[PDB]
């Protein structure tokens, strides 16, 4: 009851860290101490200061003696009673009781006199809005003209079956007996001249007998001409909508190529694993005394995906020209050997589909940056394909059971592209199709835009991550090529080959394997522990860069 | 421990919750245009309405043409000078009114088209007649998509909203109901309706809206009302790209806690189409199903309600979602195949009822929404 | 042009249609008139390829619309003038001086002029009116100044100050420089408005609207991992509350939590640890939840407000160190000094002594409490 009382302040100083923050904390404490800050405000401020330190904040709460209105909010201010007295003639006592007239808010006050940020849209979304703008333009004018034609023809058939002795003094009220006062005025002022529209309106109101039929005839001629122009505009709008709409609805996929070029590099993949290690080491000193021996976790539930990635790799190898043929076959059997040795798949299955710890199931690969980056590219392709496969059956059932509406088939509205040229997914399995298309994209016989359009049409933009499949498998092939053809890098592989092939190893074998791997690489390079389990195919990647030294 | 990540369940109607539906539509409301370059287009109402008729939906409801509001009726919430100015301004005599132009904000954002007073009268009359039909028990659900102008205030026009008809509808509901709950699923904050009922406990205004540097800037979490209306104005700030499952998991617990805590006698539901995906000004990623699950969940409670459509700047998506709302209010689920309407060329390329969500980032993390609904639930303990 | 061809008795005969072609070819939002359709030069890139039933139920509505009027409120319940104001230096609607190239706001004049009750003839500014009165007045200025001085005998020192401001045109009040220069944090905006250290630098038009689609300043539309990493140090921005940096992995970008930095102390905070839903790109500078407030309200149990003093430049500001250490009633305006072993044990013994003092205070009272009940 004494030691924590005298050590609380400098223990809190250690916790706050930054002196500055400690300076403002002492300012908060003095402001409470000078009968200026209320105790609840001090409590909240310390809660914002020592929130994660529960024990310290709990001690502060009970030692201080806290026991658990007028919150106006930031976006409302109070008017005086002078501006409240503004006559609203329709208000009885209930509206004067329940309506707020003193507290107001404005967008200008909420912006702090700075403005607002509009949401960014694609250029395809912008031209979609332009198409919608022109559609509303044509349809609003046509429907307003049609309503005026209906009213005028009602007046005309009322005036046709009557005689001429009272047709001279027959008049029309404003609005022409309709529920609107201005729609016919808008139509008249648009169709006729600006200065003559008003006098036509006056001639229609005073003498409708002569003015009404010629007005109806003009309006009908303008209506049929506008509808013909609207239909042969609607052809253009429909084709541009079919060209634009699915690209407009794609948001991450429109910029996924540059984002995948920028973020699937060595630096970002090192940054992710180092950030996870930094988070674990930062939260280790606070709680969780059993610190985990892993940072990244990868699951591998499906094994056919490995054969798909291998098929894509050999397709890129056969297609490419920058690599020699011995280098091509070394890439092929290096990838096949690494996949057969790291995981539980044998070489036969690959070929047909395209303190002594005895009988060990956990296998450790100690790697430098090159093997780690190559493995990260492989896991990137695996997760990208597994996202497609895990939803392959549902999207296949959706594409196969695509019942088109009847009036689009009768009036050939639906698009024909992605069909004549065979990019729809109807009649085939969706995953196989993707791989086939991809292979075609890798081989160069398929354009990038049509591949992206087919993927976003088939998967409803959920296959945006596969737009750069060729680039990532090219980078994976390049990383394997630099993996076997670099000094102090292929020897680490060979050491992994010896460790995996020779089972029934003790812990000291793992330690001497670790320092033998470290030997090949510099004392500055990064160590990666890639742990594989034969059961459940879980891969745990641990960052031990400059740790074992 | 409040927020739970729940996948989006398919929409199922309740056959034991049949409601008499009164739908309000004036045929003139489609013949008003805000401007040449303007996003607010009342024309989107009638191709919503043409989707109702063509879906035969009308049969399942009672169609009414509400009497347009007059000046005095309008002055039940707004001032006399603002309603006068609205009834007297035209694009012709704009140079006669510059002081009122800056005074009431009419101009620019809220333009001056010559059918302004008639459009506002149609909207206000639809709202007040729906509230009247709810008061007299002639219907259980009142539908009026011509209104929804939730940004209008006492003496100003903002957000493409001139007359706050929702305030008049809630006022008419207050003459027969002691407690009224207004729910705003528009992507914008319902600043006019919340400001109108900020200091009262008779109206609770819950607004699920995007709160960033977005319009209108109000609707921050600490805004809970002052005076007698303290903890009677719930604001739910959301980030960009909230999808159907996330929106369901924030909407359903909050609205459930309001029902079992505030216990309203009537419900007003602002069905903003700007919260849909692909919207011109909205920044949410809601599909039609995600927009419709809120209306189905609030229909499951059995409280007399009034569904009033507000925003929405892409006409096809808001029309399809309003048709699906109106179909859901008759305890049916419309098939995803459009019948032939006159405006059939809008809904390309698949010509189906579904509004497809975009594949943009659901940046609303579970921790942030858990904190937001924890603060909301803590504030809701005082509404008994 | 003789629209209604009336007869000799005034009876209507036939009207002639006006010039429909006067505005039949007005450009719509499509870029073409409504009379014609699209041109070929947009049909190349609009269409995919350019080589150079009526069962409507929508006409039955009017039969089934019943009117609704059942509401309770039914029935009744030469030189060109400047583009800126000469008084406030801001744009807007102006009244222009005729014989003077200065223009004023309608509200900026003495007296302010109604925008509907304009002067019928010519309007001059106060400086121009003074010039015409002097030109008109035979007496030289100094003669009129002296006559005003002797006429206003009751006030002599302000007589020149009273006289010379009739010549001055009305202007918006602006604080003088020596009022503003003593506070270095206080700046002046573009319109002359107040600005201080709690104000952001206004972002130029390039940053908001002239950026790419993927890179938006809101930082909500894409996965940007170059925000958890310090630019000048290269380390990771550890959030203060969660003590973590949720960078994500670009294969699961939903695991990445957004992080900002405070605009004063650069303390990084997650957007979920502090309840916020934006990055405060424009407006006031965001302040982390860790700073001390410059304005507080306390309940009297009315209320009492407290505001921190503004920063003052080193010439007019002096910092003093109290002689009294314990109980010095400062105003809250405080500055901390660095620390220069026996203090810890002295504190320890002081807390110890005071604690048995508190214990004996409790004991000497509770005995009286239990001895009260027998009587």
């Amino acid at each position: 009851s004494l030691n924590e009382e005298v050590t609380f302040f400098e223990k809190a100083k250690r916790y706050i860290g930054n002196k500055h923050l400690y300076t403002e904390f002492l300012k908060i404490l003095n402001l409470y101490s000078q009968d200026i800050l209320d105790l609840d405000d001090l409590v909240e401020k310390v809660d914002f200061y020592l929130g994660s330190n529960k024990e310290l904040f709990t001690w502060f709460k009970n030692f201080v003696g806290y026991q658990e209105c007028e919150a106006f909010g930031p976006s409302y201010k109070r008017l005086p009673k002078s501006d409240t007295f503004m006559p609203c003639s329709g208000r009885d006592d209930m509206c004067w009781e329940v309506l707020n007239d003193e507290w107001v808010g404005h967008p200008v006050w909420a912006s702090e006199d700075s403005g607002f940020i509009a949401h960014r849209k694609n250029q395809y979304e912008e031209t979609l809005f332009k198409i919608e703008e022109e559609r509303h333009e044509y349809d609003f004018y046509i429907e307003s003209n049609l309503r005026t034609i209906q009213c005028l023809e009602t007046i005309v058939n009322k005036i046709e079956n009557m005689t001429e002795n009272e047709k001279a003094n027959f008049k029309l009220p404003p609005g022409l007996g309709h529920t609107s006062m201005t729609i016919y005025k808008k139509v008249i002022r648009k169709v006729y001249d600006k200065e003559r529209g008003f006098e036509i309106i006056d001639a229609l109101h005073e003498h409708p007998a002569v003015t009404a039929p010629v007005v109806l005839k003009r309006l009908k001629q303008k209506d049929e001409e506008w509808r013909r122009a609207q239909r042969e505009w609607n052809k253009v709008w429909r084709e541009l909508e079919q060209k634009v709409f699915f690209k407009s609805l794609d948001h991450l996929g429109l910029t996924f190529k540059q984002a995948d070029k920028k973020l699937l590099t060595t630096k970002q993949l090192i940054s992710e694993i180092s950030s996870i290690k930094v988070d674990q080491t930062n939260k280790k000193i606070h709680w969780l005394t059993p610190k985990p021996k892993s940072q990244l976790d990868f699951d591998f539930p499906d094994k056919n995906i490995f054969y798909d990635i291998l098929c894509l790799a050999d397709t890129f190898i056969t297609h490419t020209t920058a690599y020699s043929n011995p280098d091509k076959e070394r890439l092929k059997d290096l990838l096949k050997y690494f996949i057969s040795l790291f995981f539980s798949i044998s070489f036969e299955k690959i070929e047909e589909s395209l303190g002594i710890i005895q009988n060990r199931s956990i296998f450790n690969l100690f790697a430098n940056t090159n093997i780690y980056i190559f493995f990260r590219h492989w896991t990137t392709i695996y997760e990208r394909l597994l996202e497609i496969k895990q939803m392959n059956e549902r999207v296949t059932k959706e594409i196969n059971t695509r019942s088109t509406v009847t009036f689009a088939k009768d009036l050939d509205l639906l698009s024909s592209q992605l069909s004549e040229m065979g990019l729809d997914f109807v009649g085939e399995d969706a995953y196989k199709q993707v791989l086939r298309l991809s292979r075609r994209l890798i081989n160069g016989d398929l354009e990038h835009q049509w591949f992206e359009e087919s993927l976003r049409q088939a998967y409803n933009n959920k296959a945006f991550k596969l737009y750069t499949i060729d680039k990532v498998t090219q980078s994976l092939v390049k990383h394997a090529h630099t993996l076997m053809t670099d000094a102090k890098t292929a020897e680490i592989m060979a050491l992994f080959v010896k460790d995996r092939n020779a089972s029934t190893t003790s812990a000291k074998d793992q330690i001497i394997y670790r320092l033998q791997v470290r030997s090949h690489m510099s004392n500055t390079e990064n160590m990666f522990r890639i742990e594989f389990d034969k059961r459940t195919l879980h891969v745990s990647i641990q960052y031990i860069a400059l740790d074992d030294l | 421990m409040v927020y739970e990540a729940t996948p989006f369940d398919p929409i199922t109607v309740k056959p034991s919750d049949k409601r008499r539906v009164a739908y309000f539509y004036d045929a003139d409301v489609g013949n008003y245009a805000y401007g040449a370059g303007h996003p607010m287009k009342p024309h989107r109402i009638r191709m919503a309405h043409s989707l109702i008729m063509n879906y035969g939906l009308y049969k399942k409801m009672e169609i009414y043409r509400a009497k347009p509001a007059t000046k005095q009726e309008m002055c039940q919430f707004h001032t006399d000078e603002y309603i006068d100015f609205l009834s007297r301004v035209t694009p012709d005599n704009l140079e006669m009114f510059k002081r009122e132009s800056v005074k009431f904000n009419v101009g620019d954002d809220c333009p001056v088209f010559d059918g302004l007073y008639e459009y506002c009268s149609i909207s206000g009359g639809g709202s007040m007649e729906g509230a009247a039909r709810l008061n007299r028990g002639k219907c259980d659900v009142a539908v009026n998509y011509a209104g929804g102008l939730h940004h209008a205030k006492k003496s100003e026009a903002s957000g493409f909203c001139y007359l706050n008809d929702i305030v008049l509808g809630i006022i008419e509901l207050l003459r027969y109901h002691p407690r009224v709950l207004y729910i705003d699923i528009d992507v914008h904050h319902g600043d006019g309706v919340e400001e109108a009922f900020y200091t009262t406990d008779r109206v609770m205004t819950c607004s699920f809206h995007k709160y960033g540097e977005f319009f209108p800037g109000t609707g921050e979490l600490r805004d809970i009302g002052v005076g007698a209306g303290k903890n009677y104005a719930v604001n739910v700030p959301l980030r960009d790209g909230i999808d159907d499952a996330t929106y369901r998991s924030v909407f359903e617990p909050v609205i459930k806690k309001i029902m079992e805590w505030y216990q309203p006698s009537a419900v007003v539901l602002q069905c903003g189409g700007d919260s849909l995906s692909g919207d011109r000004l909205g920044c949410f990623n809601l599909s039609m199903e995600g927009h419709a699950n809120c209306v189905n969940y609030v229909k499951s409670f059995g409280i007399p309600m009034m569904v009033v459509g507000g925003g929405g700047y892409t006409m096809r998506n808001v029309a399809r979602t309003w048709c699906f709302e109106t179909g859901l209010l008759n305890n049916v689920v419309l098939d995803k195949d459009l019948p032939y309407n006159e405006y059939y060329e809008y809904y390309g390329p698949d010509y189906k009822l579904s509004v497809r969500p975009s594949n943009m980032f659901n940046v609303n993390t579970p921790e942030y929404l858990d904190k937001v609904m924890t603060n909301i639930f803590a504030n809701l303990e005082n509404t008994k | 042009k003789e629209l209604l061809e009336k007869d000799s008795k005034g009876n209507i005969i036939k009207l002639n249609e006006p010039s429909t072609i006067s505005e039949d070819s007005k450009v719509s939002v499509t870029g073409l008139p409504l009379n014609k359709g699209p041109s070929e030069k947009i049909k190349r890139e609009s269409l995919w390829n350019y080589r150079k039933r009526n069962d409507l139920k929508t006409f039955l509505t009017e039969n089934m619309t019943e009117e609704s009027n059942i509401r309770s409120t039914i029935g009744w319940n030469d030189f060109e003038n400047e583009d800126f104001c000469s008084a406030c230096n801001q744009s807007g609607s102006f009244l222009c001086c005729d014989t003077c190239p200065k223009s004023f706001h309608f509200l900026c004049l003495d007296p302010p002029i109604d925008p509907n009750n304009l002067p019928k003839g010519d309007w001059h500014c106060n400086e121009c009116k003074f010039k015409i009165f002097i030109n008109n007045s035979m007496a030289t200025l100094k003669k009129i100044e002296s006559n005003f001085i002797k006429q206003n005998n009751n006030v002599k020192i302000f007589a020149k100050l009273l006289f010379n401001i009739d010549s001055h045109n009305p202007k918006q009040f602006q604080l003088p420089n020596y009022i503003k220069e003593t506070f270095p944090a206080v700046k002046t905006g573009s319109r002359g408005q107040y600005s201080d250290e709690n104000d952001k630098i206004p972002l130029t038009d390039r940053q908001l609207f002239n950026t790419s689609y993927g890179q938006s300043i809101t930082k909500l539309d894409s996965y940007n991992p170059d925000t958890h990493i310090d630019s000048n140090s290269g380390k990771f921005l550890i959030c203060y509350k969660c003590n973590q940096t949720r960078l994500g992995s670009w294969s699961h970008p939903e695991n990445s939590r957004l992080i900002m930095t405070c605009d004063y102390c650069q303390t990084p905070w997650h957007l979920d640890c502090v309840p916020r839903a934006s990055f405060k790109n424009l407006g006031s500078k965001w302040k982390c939840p860790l700073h001390s407030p410059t304005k507080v309200y306390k309940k009297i149990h009315n209320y009492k407000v407290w505001k921190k003093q503004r920063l003052i430049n080193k010439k007019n500001q002096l910092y003093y160190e109290p002689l009294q250490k314990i109980g010095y009633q400062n105003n809250g305006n405080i500055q901390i000094i660095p620390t220069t072993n026996s203090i810890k044990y002295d504190f320890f013994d002081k807390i110890y002594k005071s604690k048995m003092v508190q214990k004996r205070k409790l004991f000497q009272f509770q005995e009286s409490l239990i001895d009260k009940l027998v009587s």
């Binding site: 967008p107 607002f116 | 996003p39 | 223009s103």
Partner: peptide
């Protein structure tokens, strides 16, 4: 009395939904 504008009727268009 000669008058001239600026021609925006409202104010702070920047703080609006459509500017």
């Amino acid at each position: 009395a000669r008058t001239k504008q600026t021609g925006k009727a409202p104010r702070k268009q920047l703080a609006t939904k459509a500017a």
